[PDB]
RNA sequence: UACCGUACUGCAAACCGACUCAGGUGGGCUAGUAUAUAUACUCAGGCCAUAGAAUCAACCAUGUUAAAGGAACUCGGCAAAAU
Ligand SMILES: [Mg+2]
Ligand SMILES: [Mg+2]
Ligand SMILES: [Mg+2]
Ligand SMILES: [Mg+2]
Ligand SMILES: [Mg+2]
Ligand SMILES: [Mg+2]
Ligand SMILES: [Mg+2]
Ligand SMILES: [Mg+2]
């Protein structure tokens with residue numbers, strides 16, 4: 019459903035003049051955008067969970083407006099705080115994705131370097147034993 | 156199977172000391188015209204990490220089987236006497252035991268009749284081998300006393316912040332740590348243990 | 351889905367150099383999503399690969415080069 | 425303002441000293457990874473002196489030499505090359521492991537440009553000279569090197585026949601422990 | 602204090618000062634507009650567009 | 652710190668003597684490709700010379716060597 | 723369940739200063755050693771394009787160190803040093 023080289027920033031995309039989409043425009047700047055596919059209930063970004071779409075966030079709004087009856091003093095300020103929370107959560111999903119991918123890549127390169135050194139040492143030992151063996155012969 | 160010369164001879168090489176990988180022994184007056192790389196490579200051999208992990212595990216299991224304060228001499232002899240198979244020198248065993256103590260896997264106590272001020276590194280130490288890795292390094296009674304002092308200091312700072320126009324504790328915004336990477340990493344972990 | 355566009359600016363330099371500037375008439379672009387007419391619905395017409403492998407391959411991919419400058423030769 | 429050229433010392437290369445040492449470490453790592461690099465004359469001369477120091481440190485082959493080169497030399501793919509291929513290649517060479525050929529000026533700033541390459545390799549531009557030159561025992565030099573305390577210093581294979589009678593022995597193997 | 606930057610742009614203030622309606626609100630603003638017409642200016646006010 | 656009069660064409664020419672370049676009395680010319688450079692500089696194909704045909708170096712045979720390629 | 727905004731930039735080479743101007747420009751979010759949004763190193767992320775190349779001029783700017791003294795300098799310990 020996503021073209022991940024474009025998502026990580028290493029490939030060109032559909033509508034290449036955008037280069038920084040908002041919450042909407044992720045769906046249409048995707049290079050793998052299929053028009054025949056149905057349109058999701060919430061139209062989320064990547065970097066968020068698969069359960070983040072098909073889940074209305076206004077249940078949170080009504081829930082914390084109902085059980086706390088003193089949030090009804092300034093309702094417009096409350097709605098502004100909720101919308102600010104929504105954008106902030108979309109940013110925190112991106113930050114968590116970036117930290118997870120970086121921490122994966124660190125140990126992958128850290129393993130591959132030791133594998134390369136093991137290959138180099140096991141290649142040197144063969145040459146050294148070859149020299150001493152031909153000195154024997 | 157993991158047995159290597161020291162380059163001095165008359166010993167075997169522990170993981171972390173120079174080996175001798177030349178196939179035939181040559182004396183140093185004789186080897187004077189040969190490049191030094193053709194006897195010992197100057198780099199670690201890429202198996203000393205795994206052997207060091209195995210040797211530390213055997214040192215812990217020997218300390219675990221005998222639940223007695225067990226100084227470096229008998230833990231070296233105890234690891235050696237289970238099958239010169241392992242632990243060629245006391246210095247390697249001391250290096251392993253101090254690393255295990257620094258990672259809170261074992262701890263140290265004074266040695267009677269050879270105290271030598273126990274903070275002096277020449278002092279022989281008694282190893283107890285606590286069962287789980289501790290979150291902190293000190294005696295748990297002293298850690299509890301320090302936690303009570305720190306908790307009272309936290310209450311005092313909060314009260315002083317209340318006399319001034321501030322919150323008792325710093326109020327921080329709650330964050331979101333879940334993402335697509337963590338969900339997919341969970342799926343990979345569940346399939347990996349599932350197989 | 352409708353998008354409002356400005357006209358394109360046009361430059362048509364004159365017999366004496368003036369920089370005559372024009373502007374096309376503003377237009378609206380509509381994105382119309384259609385639906386299959388009657389009984390013909392088969393023409394929506396579209397193995398697997400793990401998305402963990404997709405992200406791990408797209409993280410070890412080489413980066414896009416920085417954009418060259420219009421005077422720069424590469 | 426301290427005098428570096430005219431009073432034999434390291435070049436400044438328009439840089440602070442920590443930047444200067446880091447740039448030389450990067451260039452010596454690049455010089456041994458690709459055996460011929462092209463740069464300005466001042467960096468080329470400084471690279472030639474640094475290459476002689478680093479190559480001799482690799483020729484020692486000791487654990488302290490490996491530890492010192494581990495900080496000096498960045499790649500680690502090429503730390504192996506310095507201690508194995510370069511050390512065996514120049515095992516008997518008394519310095520001068522690198523040559524410099526001037527190559528004109530570069531387009532961006534008209535700075536003089538020199539080619540710096542390792543000698544005695546397939547793909548070098550001038551034939552090397554042998555590091556040693558076996559002496560005639562019936563010439564004046566050999567007798568001067570007998571009356572005065574000089575060694576023979578003859579050309580040698582990697583393992584001479586003087587170790588053959590030790591390595592042939594089946595009681596001097598120890599089975600590999 | 603460096604000078605020269607007296608023009609702080611704002612669309613609300615620009616339209617509210619030099620727009621058509623404040624020019625038409627007063628008589629002398631209407632003769633300002635009338636002599637702009639008599640001069641022959643292509644742009645009558647700062648907010649005119651089509 | 653300011654000229655009091657206008658410099659004449661003769662005085663300007665006399666003052667501009669430092670700006671002129673000296674002619675070089677030697678050149679190294681490749682007989683094949685007709686290239687031109689200093690006698691201390693390589694000017695073959697490895698350096699900038701799109702006209703090089705390799706005839707500038709007339710002999711280069713070096714087949715034998717033996718070493719450990721580190722891989 | 724319509725209409726308008728949605729590109730790009732936004733401490734800045736894209737705004738206000740004639741400039742690719744060392745100036746001015748509002749609000750919000752944030753990881754570790756660690757402990758404060760201060761301080762040193764670092765995470766995520768970003769950057770090392772807008773003159774380059776060597777070298778020992780004098781001199782200028784900004785600093786480091788200095789033997790024995792110590793305001794004797796100077797309109798004035800100004801400036802530095804010092805706590
Ligand atoms: Mg719209
Ligand atoms: Mg100077
Ligand atoms: Mg520094
Ligand atoms: Mg101010
Ligand atoms: Mg003005
Ligand atoms: Mg600023
Ligand atoms: Mg100005
Ligand atoms: Mg500016």
Ligand SMILES: [Mg+2]
Nearest residue numbers: 762763764765
């Ligand atoms: Mg830093």
Ligand SMILES: [Mg+2]
Nearest residue numbers: 770771773774
């Ligand atoms: Mg620059």
Ligand SMILES: [Mg+2]
Nearest residue numbers: 788789790791
């Ligand atoms: Mg003094």
Ligand SMILES: [Zn+2]
Nearest residue numbers: 681683684707
């Ligand atoms: Zn030619």
